Write a protein that binds this ligand. Structure first.
Ligand SMILES: CC(=O)N[C@H]1[C@@H](O[C@H]2[C@@H](O)[C@@H](CO)O[C@@H](O[C@@H]3[C@@H](O)[C@H](O)O[C@H](CO)[C@@H]3O)[C@@H]2NC(C)=O)O[C@H](CO)[C@H](O)[C@@H]1O
Length: 141
């Protein structure tokens, strides 16, 4: 699939073919300095953000941590929290999501950061959405 170049945030874009085992999705952008304390990348079903298979949610709060969660029919599940922050306000990042049979493997600037075990079927995902305190250079596949 051709990349999305400099899309405005908040952004929502189709993942052509849906999520597939071995698919790699890169989000390349910059964390904003004066526009809040959180962003998220959502792997979701269509345009209701009510069904989000994987919400990846860095928070520049409390020393910095990342929330990983799933939303179903509007309701957020129990969070998994990673109490390390690999991003920095005002710095560019390369964020890579690799779909695997049982989990997502998430890399930041080339280094494995977290794995998120599938809670819902990943083949149901057809949309990536990004919002909060970031600007995007590209999303690629
Ligand atoms: C960045 C983003 O996508 N924000 C939208 C999203 O925000 C939710 C979501 O990140 C869930 C994930 O579990 O967490 C909510 O945060 C709360 C805390 O603020 C709360 O006080 O503690 C809770 C744990 O006990 C939880 O972590 C977060 N909500 C808010 C208000 O920030 O979804 C929202 C709608 O639910 C809204 O769309 C945000 O914009």
């Amino acid at each position: 699939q051709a990349p999305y170049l400099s899309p405005a945030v908040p952004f929502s874009g189709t993942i052509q073919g849906g999520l597939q085992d071995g698919l790699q999705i890169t989000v390349n952008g910059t964390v904003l300095s004066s526009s809040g304390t959180r962003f998220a990348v959502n792997f979701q079903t269509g345009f209701s953000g009510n069904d989000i298979a994987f919400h990846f949610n860095p928070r520049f709060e409390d020393g910095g941590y990342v929330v990983c969660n799933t939303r179903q029919n509007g309701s957020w599940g129990p969070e998994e929290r990673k109490t390390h922050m690999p991003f920095q306000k005002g710095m560019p990042f390369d964020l890579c999501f690799l779909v695997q049979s049982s989990d997502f493997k998430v890399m930041v600037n080339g280094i494995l950061f977290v794995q998120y075990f599938h809670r819902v079927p990943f083949h149901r995902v057809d949309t990536i959405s990004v919002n909060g305190s970031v600007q995007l250079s590209y999303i690629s596949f």
